[PDB]
C-alpha cells in the first residue's frame, strides 16, 4: 500500500525493537546486580 | 535516489539491528544460565 504504508511498517518494527531493547536492558541490569 | 531508496535504506538498517538484537539476547541467556 505504497510509501505511506511502508513508513507505518517501519515505525512498527522500530517500536517493537524498542520493547526488545528494554528487555535486554532489564536482563543486563539483573545480571550486573547479582555479579557486582 | 529519493524517498523509495531511503525506505530501503531504513529497512536494511532495522534488519541488521535485529541481528544485533538477537546476538545480545543470546549473550544474556548464556550469562544468565551460568550465573543462575
Amino acid at each position: 500500500s505504497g510509501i505511506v504504508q511502508q513508513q507505518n511498517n517501519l515505525l512498527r518494527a522500530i517500536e517493537a525493537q524498542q520493547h526488545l531493547l528494554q528487555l535486554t536492558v532489564w536482563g543486563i541490569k539483573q545480571l550486573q546486580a547479582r555479579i557486582l | 535516489s529519493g524517498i523509495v531508496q531511503q525506505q530501503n535504506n531504513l529497512l536494511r538498517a532495522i534488519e541488521a539491528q535485529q541481528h544485533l538484537l538477537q546476538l545480545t539476547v543470546w549473550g544474556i541467556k548464556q550469562l544468565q544460565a551460568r550465573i543462575l
Binding site: 505504497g2 511502508q6 | 538477537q22
Partner: peptide, 29 residues
C-alpha cells in the same frame, strides 16, 4: 526470567513478521 523469555519470544516474532511484511512492500515499490 520466565516473563522475560515470553516477551522476548513475543516481540521477536512480531518484529520478524514486520520485517517480512516490509520486505514484501519494498519489492513492490
Amino acid at each position: 526470567w520466565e516473563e522475560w523469555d515470553k516477551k522476548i519470544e513475543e516481540y521477536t516474532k512480531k518484529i520478524e513478521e514486520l520485517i517480512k511484511k516490509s520486505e514484501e512492500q519494498q519489492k513492490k515499490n
